[PDB]
Design a protein around this ligand. Structure first.
Ligand SMILES: *[C@@H]1O[C@H](CO)[C@@H](O[C@@H]2O[C@H](CO)[C@@H](O[C@@H]3O[C@H](CO)[C@@H](O)[C@H](O)[C@@H]3O)[C@H](O)[C@H]2NC(C)=O)[C@H](O)[C@H]1NC(C)=O
Ligand SMILES: *[C@@H]1O[C@H](CO)[C@@H](O[C@@H]2O[C@H](CO)[C@@H](O)[C@H](O)[C@H]2NC(C)=O)[C@H](O)[C@H]1NC(C)=O
Length: 308
């Protein structure tokens, strides 16, 4: 359990087997991560109505590549990469990030960051905080209860690095194990007034076409996939699973699609900060539910604040 996940030999095997379609790297940022730690980063554990597309949506000829940041270039939350830190809160962090993106693509508010802290601590229905939770219930909680912004309640755990000498001066993740924070009802600075943000509807997505089409019209949303040990070593290219044991479910924010040398893929924002993968992003094979990635998405529509 305090054993390293990765070895040079494991990585060499992965890179033989993957045929150079993606690159695994041993002495990357995850070189020394242990099994206990790697498992804690995957915090998906465990219903919404299915999305229905109108006749118009359904007949759109979707382009052969698409990137949310290019399609909504005035929405500054889209390209930001989060850091869930030493806590299994991806389910909440990928939800909050996408909710912030959607306030801009749909909800008329250019730059509000939805608080993943509030959701993590207060949505007890959703799961068990830092020990993991359920993406779908997170979206349902955004409708029924609503969430404050991170200006009100900032994410309570600092960035941490799996490198021993972090490029960004982040402290080591191993020196931390965090437990679910207490749910609060005022902002950290109590003189900042509580502003509550809410969606009016939530829904589930399934399959390559649903996903593409939802992304095209409405923008980023949250998906989950199975994490194997070879994923830990990902450095670049279009991932697909070739070796390693199952490490758990992980939620992430889907932001784009394309094709690279004949391989269709999804572009995805991870939440392990910008030191990991391709500046915080990874590509993964699209079209064949690689590691279950197309088995269920969760999304919703933010309600615009105030009135006209
Ligand atoms: C709700 O408010 C509570 C109470 O203020 C927030 O709890 C506080 O969270 C911070 C950040 O983790 C904790 O800081 C730690 O303090 C310990 C002991 O002083 C120190 O050794 C650490 O280095 C770190 O500074 C603080 O202890 C903690 N307070 C309590 C009572 O647990 C909480 O995070 C807020 N909830 C949300 C969702 O943000
Ligand atoms: C993983 O752990 C090994 C060994 O601790 C790291 O290697 C040490 O790195 C520090 C700083 O780079 C050096 O001063 C030591 O000489 C190294 N020790 C040995 C035995 O190699 C390695 O840097 C760690 N890798 C990462 C990415 O954090």
């Amino acid at each position: 359990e305090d054993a390293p996940v990765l070895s040079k030999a494991f990585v060499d095997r992965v890179n033989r087997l993957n045929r150079g379609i993606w690159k695994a790297k041993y002495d990357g940022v995850m070189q020394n991560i242990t099994l206990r730690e790697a498992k804690r980063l995957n915090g998906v554990i465990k219903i919404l109505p299915k999305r229905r597309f109108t006749e118009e949506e359904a007949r759109a000829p979707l382009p052969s590549s698409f990137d949310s940041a290019e399609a909504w270039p005035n929405c500054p939350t889209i390209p930001q990469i989060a850091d869930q830190s030493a806590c299994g809160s991806c389910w909440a962090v990928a939800a909050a990030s996408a909710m912030s993106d959607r306030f801009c693509t749909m909800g008329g508010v250019q730059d509000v960051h939805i608080s993943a802290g509030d959701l993590l601590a207060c949505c007890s229905d959703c799961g068990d905080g830092c020990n993991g939770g359920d993406p779908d219930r997170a979206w349902a909680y955004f409708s029924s209860t609503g969430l404050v912004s991170d200006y009100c309640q900032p994410y309570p755990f600092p960035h941490c690095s799996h490198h021993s000498k972090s490029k960004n001066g982040y402290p080591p993740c191993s020196q931390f194990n965090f437990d679910t924070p207490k749910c609060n009802y005022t902002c950290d600075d109590p003189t900042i007034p509580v502003v509550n943000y809410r969606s009016w509807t939530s829904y589930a997505l399934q399959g390559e076409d649903d996903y593409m089409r939802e992304l095209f019209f409405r923008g980023p949303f949250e998906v989950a996939f199975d994490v194997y040990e070879d994923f830990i070593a990902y450095n670049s290219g279009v991932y697909h699973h070739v070796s390693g044991q199952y490490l758990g479910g992980h939620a992430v924010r889907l932001v784009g699609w394309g094709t690279s040398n004949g391989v269709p893929y999804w572009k995805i924002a991870n939440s392990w900060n910008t030191e990991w993968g391709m500046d915080g992003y990874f590509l993964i094979r699209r079209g064949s539910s690689e590691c279950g990635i197309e088995d269920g998405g969760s999304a919703g529509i933010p309600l615009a604040p105030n009135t006209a």
